[PDB]
Amino acid sequence: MLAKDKVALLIGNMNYREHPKLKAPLVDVYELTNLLRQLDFKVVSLLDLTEYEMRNAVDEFLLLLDKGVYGLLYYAGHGYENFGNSFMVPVDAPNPYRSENCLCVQNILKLMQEKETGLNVFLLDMCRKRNDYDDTIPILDALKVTANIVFGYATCQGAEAFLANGIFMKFLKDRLLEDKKITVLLDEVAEDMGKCHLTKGKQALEIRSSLSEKRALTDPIQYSAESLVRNLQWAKAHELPESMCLKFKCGVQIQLGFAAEFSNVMIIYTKIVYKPPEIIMCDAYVTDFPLDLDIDPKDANKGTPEETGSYLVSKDLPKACLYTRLSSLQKLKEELVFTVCLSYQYEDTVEDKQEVNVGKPLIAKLDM
Amino acid sequence: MLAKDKVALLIGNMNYREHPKLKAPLVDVYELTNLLRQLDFKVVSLLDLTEYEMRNAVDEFLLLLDKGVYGLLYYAGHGYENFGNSFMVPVDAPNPYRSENCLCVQNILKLMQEKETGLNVFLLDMCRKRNDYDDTIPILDALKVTANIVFGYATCQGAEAFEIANGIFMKFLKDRLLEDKKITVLLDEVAEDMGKCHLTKGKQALEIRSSLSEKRALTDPIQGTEYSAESLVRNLQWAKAHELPESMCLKFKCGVQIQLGFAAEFSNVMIIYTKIAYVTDFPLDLDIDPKDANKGTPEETGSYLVSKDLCLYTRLSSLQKLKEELVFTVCLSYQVEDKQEVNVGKPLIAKLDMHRH
Ligand SMILES: FC(F)(F)c1nccc(N[C@H]2CC[C@@H](Nc3ccnc(C(F)(F)F)n3)CC2)n1
């Protein structure tokens, strides 16, 4: 079979303000992004989205899916299942949450079908228990027999989905690259989960499929004018700032470098590249970040990138630096302008600062 | 993989009292029964059941299940799907009907999991639209994670499972059911067959819902004899399920000799045939309309069976309502009128006394 394009939206919610925090979405969204990139998928990987951001990511994602396009949606975070319907809980959801606060996966499904997609895959890596607080039970004028929808739930209905992978991604990542029909592939991952001593009687993956064709994530991509609008927009979506050298008044030169962690998460690192022998104590640190980004000023300027909450370990980046993680690039509405500070001793410590403008990095370039 | 046993309950509802009548269940239940028998399944195939009869049949099927047993439910008839749950509408359901009139499939599955079954297959050949008269919101008891459940729906959710001869689902299922493939994989190839065929592509699509985590197939061999006070009950109940009356010869005072024969069509359906003479005075619970009895051909009784497979033929299709022994009269008119009463016990599913539940 042929695919017009292969596009994926991966959402990983961990830092909830009113609900317990999660760990697995960080490793699983990162690892799934890499495997999907290997399968020639254009992937958008988003961490910690509010209801507003989640709705805008799903809506803009639909305004990319076209006739014959293979679309994949992966969600990892707090979730619930009420009367057949699945809901994904945003990080800003109140306590308790109701369906108006969350996104119904069945609503996403029907809107994808109105784009005539060639394959719709939904991987829901979440708990499927009932939400006692949901007064409404939505009845959709459900279905359109497109015979191309595959759902892979991490667990069964009324059960739980338990720097390490979650149970679903642990088994899924070992086979995702195989050249088999996605239903056959998901069924083999279920057999793998079954063989695991840990899952027996607790977690089992459930597959709901109406796929009537041999369609796989390994299908080659077949070009249209409308495809070039999403191809150009996707090229602009992951541009990273170039590493810049900053020369200070005292002779100290600093390298300021950038790494992509997710489509909305960036690592900023500072390194002292030249130090005049006359200077003994020398520290460089970043401050004055846009308030939109809501960066914790203490989870900045860490000796290792793990301390910032990053997936990337010390040996994954240029080494012997100071790391700062900006995990909310979707909230940036202006240009990324901040201050680089230099403190140095030769009795009084000496300070000097330089302002740096690095434009709108990664998903911020997509003016939303 | 190995199975303790392979047990199937097939229900085909067509003669609805207050709803449109159906046609396909007769041919589809008959042919699915024969396929599952080739795979060594103990099959109980029943047609036209009331709410009371379907609950009784489900309790009789559940007594045939034990730990590691492959259980299969196939239903063809009127059905509906509300709030994630599938309901099977019995032939005596009123118009309109509610959940308390029907049998919920998930309730049956929950009972099968209490039996520690090794495989649970549900092949639901019915429409999946909402019943707008059922205001009932499921409780519901969150099912155990047994990782051995396979649903095979004839259509997608909110769509109709219209019929055209076999029904669409059984037509595609018949070509594949005998293969040594994992049931989820086998069902998935059937879905591809329906999508490949020109006159079904776009109009009807199979839906497969599955949590099976082991390579279990309807072709798996059955393990050796289990020696317990539970296997002795289960087998001595199955040995009485399909007993057919022995062919008898009746001699009359005028010298005439008539052969009385019997044939099984379903677990609750038996044809009676007389060769040189008409049969009458059947038990009232059987509801045998004399206008349908004593036909020159079995096709005139409404039987699946034709002249070639087997005189005067009488179709007894409600054997599950037989609460006492089957006593009837063989009348003989000649040129004047003589009669002889015949007792043939409780044939087929009648010997199981399902009314016990
Ligand atoms: F969530 C949020 F950050 F708040 C947010 N706010 C506003 C929009 C928005 N859009 C999301 C992320 C960007 C995506 N843009 C493209 C473009 C081309 N091809 C692809 C694909 F990779 F999917 F094929 N994606 C579309 C979905 N997200």
Curated annotation (Swiss-Prot), chain B:
Tissue specificity remark: Highly expressed in peripheral blood mononuclear cells. Detected at lower levels in bone marrow, thymus and lymph node, and at very low levels in colon and lung.
Residues at the active site: 78, 127
Subcellular localization: Cytoplasm, Perinuclear region; Nucleus
Short sequence motif Nuclear export signal: positions: 32-39
Task of the protein: Protease that enhances BCL10-induced activation: acts via formation of CBM complexes that channel adaptive and innate immune signaling downstream of CARD domain-containing proteins (CARD9, CARD11 and CARD14) to activate NF-kappa-B and MAP kinase p38 pathways which stimulate expression of genes encoding pro-inflammatory cytokines and chemokines. Mediates BCL10 cleavage: MALT1-dependent BCL10 cleavage plays an important role in T-cell antigen receptor-induced integrin adhesion. Involved in the induction of T helper 17 cells (Th17) differentiation.
Subunit field text: Homooligomer; forms oligomers which bind to TRAF6. Forms a complex with CARD14 and MALT1; resulting in the formation of a CBM (CARD14-BCL10-MALT1) complex. Forms a complex with CARD11 and MALT1; resulting in the formation of a CBM (CARD11-BCL10-MALT1) complex. Forms a complex with CARD9 and MALT1; resulting in the formation of a CBM (CARD9-BCL10-MALT1) complex.
Family membership: Belongs to the peptidase C14B family.
Protein name as it appears in the record: Mucosa-associated lymphoid tissue lymphoma translocation protein 1
Source organism: Homo sapiens
Gene that this sequence comes from: MALT1
